[model samples]
Target: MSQITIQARLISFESNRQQLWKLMADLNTPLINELLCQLGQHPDFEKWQQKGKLPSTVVSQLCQPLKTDPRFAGQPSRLYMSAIHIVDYIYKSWLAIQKRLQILLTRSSSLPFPLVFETNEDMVWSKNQKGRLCVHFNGLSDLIFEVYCGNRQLHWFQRFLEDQQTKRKSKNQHSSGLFTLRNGHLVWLEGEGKGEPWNLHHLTLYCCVDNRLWTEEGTEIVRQEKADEITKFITNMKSDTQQALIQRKQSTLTRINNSFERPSQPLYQGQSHILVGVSLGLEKPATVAVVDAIANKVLAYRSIKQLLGDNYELLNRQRRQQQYLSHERHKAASELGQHIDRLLAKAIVALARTYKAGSIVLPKLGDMREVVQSEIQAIAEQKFPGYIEGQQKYAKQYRVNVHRWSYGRLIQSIQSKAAQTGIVIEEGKQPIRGSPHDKAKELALSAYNLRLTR
Candidate 1:
């Protein structure tokens, strides 16, 4: 499916071969239109269109109009066959196009199918052709064009040389066929059957800028490294050809293996009744608790912060972020909050994967004032020791972190991460008799039972 463009330089002085190529490109538009126009001529065109393939006799008769032109008479049979198949490809897609648009409002056009030479009976790489390539357009009277290998094509051309027998009559020179000289080196011979040789280089056009005429349409497309050579060519002149090459870049498409640690997968594959209950909290971000409702048992429970593996320094940064009047500091704080949510989400998914849970349960964010109040109350007891005014001073600072804690963002992050492993994020209804850390397990189990019932 991936490709590289290589230029085929026509080396032969044969007028017929050169003129035929130009003719094909020129006839490309009109011939395609004519072929499409001839489609209605067949009574079974609709029937033939519905079925994938057409009868060979039908295809030849469809191409009978092509025979009227003397210019097409001496042309290769491959040419007509190409038109038929191309017409089919276009027609099939066209039918689909009509269906899509009719199902819609309205609009259309497809570019003309170019007359392209395919590599089958027409183009031969090396059929006893040594290391060289061949293109035969004329009939069975041994007419072909020789295709020379450029530097980019050396590897494949050498493969053709490998097919030839190593048995030799003399030294380095080759007269009859191909020979391997010194492993990487090769030798090839020319014969009467060999057609006009062409050199195909793996070259792609870069942007072309005409420094001389200023508005010269095409000229100066070359590789970045070869820019100096082409720049010298264009400014100095063709010296002065209307169209010319500046530089052509060369690239390769290939597979490259990247090394990294893969995320953990589920320990068990088949688990329909197991679920990871996720509850958002104040002190430690969130909690993930795995519960096996089928067996009515709890598997595991832990805080999102425990999975985060961090310190109180992050907690203290919250106070600074809240009080800071500077927008610049707030900019960094926003990103940090995002990172925390993303990390917490990853932790939740990893826990779910480790436990082989089917879905993650997340309850709505509401009525957790006591969760923050408890932290504030505990800190007030430890720091102020029953002094009301001092407790209020520290309580204000502690509550700064709680205001920004949103469960929605954390749930969103979990949803994205879970999508990779097909882990569903189930919405959990808040328990009326809510408990503390084990609350997530209760929420998840409720959701799990709800899923099975529905």
Candidate 2:
């Protein structure tokens, strides 16, 4: 079961055939629109449209009911009716392709093999060829040849790997036979010639499906899994995690304002008095402490867990609502994780703004893997003797693994905001001797003292 993931961009072709381009664009729009309009009149069409979906069964069923009617009995009407199913096939095919693309994009790396498919006039007619189309793809050669051909080249690579299983592969492996398939026909290539060396070009994909029939029936499990992956990817793709955090901060500030205005007093003589420190943790998103450095007093203390009371409970309940659908469960997990991270960031930013601190100290989470280790440790401690068996289930339920939260992303967000606010982040002179939250206060004071000495 191979997963064919492709990243394709619809781009204009720089071909000499200008007339073909205009014809291609004009021909498809009217036909597509006409087909869409015809399908729109069906009773169940509106429901599918609202969901941004069209199951293969629904498309055929709708067309089947109308085909027997006298209005669709003519040659033109029958062709038009058949065309509806064809268009629906194309729609579902493109959607499946898009779902695959989103799955690849959710990864941190660039697309495995990027392809730019020129949607020219020729492509408009390519489908009509009905497996007879002779297609060719052209692009620049990538340093890594696999990048040029994408997963299509993986078979050969795997063959090479299999050969090495007994002997243990060395650096001096003779690897060649890089090519692509066009309707089961091979368009093979080895290396580039001298002329296009600087230009760096190659053919990416030139293939046609064997038939136009589309079905999403037998592989319900695969289809459901793809849908789940797509839903998760979409949630992560459009999320304004940082913006959400900032808005949450503003709301916090507004609530604080309702009680009392920020202190209007001046700093101690030759000293910046107020200092803010942020401590990172998993038990609660984060803990913030605002200290009056001159008086060695804690002016304010806020725990993200406490501030966002019942938010986690709310999220758990929300997850429960969508537990039946795997896709919904996946989407909820991503959303809730993002919500927690953003809320933590909000607490940090809100504290800086509230205290009007000269410096904001953030805990140096050196080696993020340690954070993951610590989390697993905490889980073990909670579950005790059954930790080994229960850890996986717990991690899946709450997503306690730091890697999933994308620790670098959260740190990067705060650092970017700090730069804009003219806040200085410094390593403290003292080790984290006691409770991390209180240690943060001492670190903030240390930073404040350092500022004064300077």
Candidate 3:
């Protein structure tokens, strides 16, 4: 599935549009939450999960009682249908989590709560004959989004059309000239989806999404006598830069505070004495160690074992599958694994902030594959005996989770989040000796020391 989500701002704003947005946004979450509650309480819920997904026909039947719900009368089909879709999405996600953890899903845990949104299913996109790109809402025909289509977007739309043509050309696709029954004899027809029209299927829009009321335009003024004129201009440029930064910080803090319901986190530090390091692993997602850059000593470390605690096995399963297939594909395994790395990246950054560390180190983890190999060796020693049959089984189970382990993605995620938080990152190596967590701290400080020598 091409699960690429892009944002389109509402340009055709009006009073009714505004009112409609508020009405939907207000109703969506509570209704979804109630449906989620209902689904959890349903008797067949566990049976559906045991099958790994709620069947499509079952989904249609599942939401009928919810359709006649008294509180939801007169509501459009879009609302409840999208509600069912969202709950099913969450259910599959919960299933994946359970598959990774080897446990049953309990709703009370931190599988994400439903997010507030306009609606996922009710909108459609098409280019009008007038050469304007526009969106249609199923129930609200009057409401429109004159999408700001750049050449890039227009190119994508045309590209999809070409894909439709390509799909119909496939030999395996349905093909028959129309042959029908006169006296109940036989009917035949010609039809990718040989019969279906070229249209968007999985493309979803996150509509009625709101943004800030103002943009980040700024102002500056400069004054000087001719001698000091050039000097004053340069000085004012510095001051001008500083003034904007002050407001930037204020705006950031304001945005952060507005979304928070209670007392907020301490202001982000512009400078800090702590140094942090992240060690990558197969068993654990990561271990983040903090250093007292002042004392030149290790203060503490956190092993992020549980972050991907449930999901790592899936990646390993694919690596083993490759050994059985003459030509194996590793395409599908990391779909969820990427999210684990993203969460690990954020966890690392949060540690840097909690300890007020200004710099973080990520290992040069290309060589880090060595850890995975050693781990496999240990697993083989413990589980498989010294015989050839057992040996070949271990070999089949051998991995390039080392190969598939996306150190690039991990570093890239941390780099992006750290960039926002004003923490610099260094990719550094550690001494081959010492316990892995301690070695991680030394690796962090090696980056620290590398900077000091300059």
Candidate 4:
């Protein structure tokens, strides 16, 4: 409940008499690997060679960030691995402790962090009571107190002392106990009195597992969810009210009907024009208008409705196609939308210094084709309404051969309109077919038109 400030201390000791002994122990490889990886290098406990050692800078990059927490002291004591690998080790170690804690919590009311003891040297063997094998550890504070093994430690001494005829290296040497306190402080007896803070500098090792482990107070928030919220919902299993709510949805049949019945609101200006120049064959002609309504007049200039022929049917048809495709009603709706947006951008930049239109309405099938062609109409109906008609039952039979002539005429009309007004309108992509077709031609023309207007 109170604010806490943490300070670290180094723990080291060297006091020995004679002791030739042998003992056996297993090396904790996972723990060692975890530590080395975090440091961004391998621990060469045996001076093992490493491949492609990571530079200290990278280690700093990887491990330095982890120092923010009160637990792991931003700097790794061991230089066995790169900082990145060390971080990975730290995370995995934390995860492991968490998993173990969870298991403990599930089985009991309280979970206790297990004590871990580590030493500098591997367990060894000796026959004379003169060669003392030393052990070293860095962060062994609080919950990580060493197992001292003093008189308890000397049991190995007795076993190895064999003949015992005073094979002492110093004769008057003394030994003492070692432990770590709850305040993250170490207690190493002997070799003191000179004061000046004992001069015993502890290495930059860390006691991670203790801080990483959770106590009993951690599980207070876990509880079961509400019955209704946890269960899967099924519509058909619901009451009459649910069915009524679903019935209110606008069905595909209704949407299809709307697509055909919706009133056509002809936009005045600010609409994109696709010029589909009608030329006989690929060689080109003096001029050809697939739809006479446009080539004879509309293409050169805006001809009001009266100038249109009952062939007026042709005008509307082409107009519808241009409108729908321009607005991105084609199969590639998303891509076309982007393409149209780019066109608008070009238009905007070019018009910035001139009589720029107030709007850019990219034509879509819905805009031009008074009737959503059967192809797109079906897609919209199915998607919007979530209709479940089998895909096999539907065929993509609507391939309207909208030649370049219609688009050419439309583009010419728009450009001519600007020319008459003393305004230089830039050219943009001539209307082209769907993807994989020559989009370059249209884009090139449009870009060029942008240059002229500028």
Candidate 5:
């Protein structure tokens, strides 16, 4: 079998890059309204983009209002660009900005923004929203065209306006049901029972602060190596959190798309970002950077929530809904517990499979480098004279657990065996003095749920 492997990644960000992202976000806030007004101005914008006459009127209308809008008026021209364009520009722009800002922050010794990055917004966008898919790519970049549908939806939305017309509706009292996209555009439900209205949402478009680099070659090598190292590290290390060697590798690249090019700004003043972990399900999620499948360049990103967040949520909701129907507590508990265990088991197997596996035959201790079996026996004899070996036959010396049977060594052996197979042994979480299960159980029982005797 292929050597089982594991991957671990760490993220780092320069202060300036983060600022640039925030700047972009701030710029976009007004920009979104400006763009929406622009979309609204285009009464039949879709037809125009498709086969009809595209008008400059939409752009003209949006610009006039934005001149006075608090968010969009004086923002940089680049702020109105498409998401992809923004991503590329910000990266290059911030690289240059970083250099300048580093000196400022270092000299000032104060945070330009805040001490840490905090996500200000999270949202979802969908096609079959309450009414119509409100947003879509216009033929041109930087413009997200909105198309509103649903006569009933308009009516439901009118209720929102009506609710506003009356006393302020309870912050919780949504208009029967309010539908929105990740961008916060409102949609109304349509159709027969659709009037009954479950909010129809699309994909989410949350704003995040962790900016990651798009470096390719070095990143890939690091990813492959890091994965192996992570698995090895976690397997062997005592703490759940472990570190791995992080490396950056890049040679050169030319921008094919002119819009994606970076400006001549310095790095310190530019944007910086890192990929950090986001909790999705009950367990630690397995996430990867957005990467180009063909070239393997880190592209955008892939979050458990962003990719399958809705699906997971829907399933989670279904689980809760189904719980009401499950009458037998024991059966329900058993089933749910098994479901969770299976999920964890899959991750464990996946992780274990990632590491190349084989047995670590303890070298004869005669060479006397590391401890020998005889040395172990000698130590054991000091405690239980004449009965140590027999104890091993009975209960593994009562000292060592099943995990310590040289799992790391076994992993190491697997690597050695697979040396010809492009697989090599790597360390995972290093071994702790106590067993993982033991430590885990003890810690868990110590929690408020269980009553412990001692």
Candidate 6:
């Protein structure tokens, strides 16, 4: 059996409208409007509006005539390009926050269960006659949480059992409902009535820890040697069931081979165990942190709210403005434009880049444009659309742009990737005494000199 490990993290969301608005209105709105108007006049305006999703292409085509026009001879091209970027940024931000709020509200609105049973064991599973299955809790056998197995769930359970049985004989067995446990409480009525919505009165905190015990001696080397010997012994053994390594009949040769195989190595290397710190909250710039214990270096840092900002009123206002400006063909474009201006200003201040009083720091346009276009295409794919619909009100409220949703997806992807490589994530309720990565480095070094000690 695999050793159980736990990891915990706390996440909180805070909304601000004033700060959001202040940041959004820093762009040159008038200049942006002129450019949009010019683009609207293009012969392929309708096709471009519907499918001219590429901002770089839109900018190139629109700016060609405007660039040479005497009316805008003195103005820099950066302003025009920034306009498109600002629109995309603000829309993306708003879309993100709106969806986040919708999820929090909907998920917390209704209770999934009524009674909360405390289990003595971490978890319990049981099956009995009458086709009834329930998880028993300590100190209250009478008040157990029953599994409401419908036809589909029942079929799934049967398949799971069959798969396990097949593996045992050969040798493996491997792994939600309206009446499900919601927020650790019972929910749903007898037949089909939806439970009353529950209000959020307290912040939910999640914390977990992953514990690892390492040997100070050269134990691993001995284990490796033993493993090698075991493999050689198994390889040389005849297929004849009569030949046995012990008094008892030998188990399947496959089983013997499996028993000797070493598990994969852990995620981080000695020098690679660096730290990352991330700040959260819209109120302050940087707040939270994660650090590499040994070298004590910061990896990544950013405000939590920088991940997303909230302003329902402003979002609605922009939606209306976009609807009016473009006949709703592109709702929230104006607001998104304003938002972009604010964001650019913040980025300028944060990066401390050299720039004239009026100009903002503009990174290479090609990379930015490609990223935006590719993301747009990816978001248009089936992956996000179904999930948007699956989440309900969020889809209707935010239109579910993939750009806004990409951050968390990326973070999760990186975490999973590291986990696959055997890198253990150490997190828990109580703070660790010192840097975990430093300890890992120390352990690794100690392991090397272990043979000398013997």
| Top-lDDT structure, candidate number | 3
Which residue pairs in candidate 3 collide? 100-310, 176-190, 179-188, 191-194, 400-403
Question: What lDDT is obtained when candidate 2 is compared to the true structure?
Answer: 0.45
Q: Would you give me the overall lDDT of model 6?
A: 0.33
Checking candidate 1 for backbone clashes, the offending pairs are: 144-195, 146-196, 220-246, 221-246, 221-247, 222-247, 222-248, 223-247, 223-248, 237-240
Highest TM-score against the true fold, candidate:
3
Sort by lDDT, best first: what order?
3, 1, 2, 6, 5, 4
Candidate 4 has an lDDT of 0.29
Candidate 3 residues 202-291, lDDT tens each?
122332211111111100010112224434544565578667865654443333222111123333564456788887655444677888
lDDT of 5 at 332: 61
Q: Candidate 2: list runs displaced more than 4 Å.
A: 1-272, 309-335, 371-405, 419-421, 427-433, 446-454
Candidate 1's error at 288, in angstroms?
1.0
lDDT digits (tens) for residues 305-390 of candidate 6? 34234533443454456546654445543336345334423432332211111111111222333433443444334245655454
Model 5 residue 218 CA deviation (Å) reads: 5.5
Q: Which regions in candidate 5 have their CA more than 4 angstroms from the true location?
A: 1-31, 48-72, 76-321, 325-454
Per-model TM-score, in order, reads 0.36, 0.33, 0.40, 0.15, 0.21, 0.22
Model 1 has an lDDT value of 0.52
lDDT of 3 at 326: 25
The reply for model 6, stretches above 4 Å from the true place, is 1-124, 130-132, 148-405, 417-454
- Tell me the tens digit of each residue's lDDT in model 5 across 1-454: 2222211111113432343335543564445443444454555644433443333334444455664677555544433434223222333354455445551111122111111111112111223334443322222122232334345334322322333332233433222111111122111112233321122211122222111111222223334543465456545653122232211111101111111111232122111121111111111122322211224233333333443433456435434544543434436632443333333323322322233222111112123222234334444554566765574653443333211122233233333333322222222121112222322222222221221231
RMSD per candidate (Å) reads 22.9, 26.8, 23.8, 32.8, 26.6, 31.3
Report the number of backbone clashes for model 3.
5
The residue ranges of model 4 lying beyond 4 angstroms of the native Cα positions read 1-90, 96-148, 156-194, 197-454
Worst 10 residues of 5 by lDDT: 248-257
Relative to the true structure, candidate 4 reaches a TM of 0.15
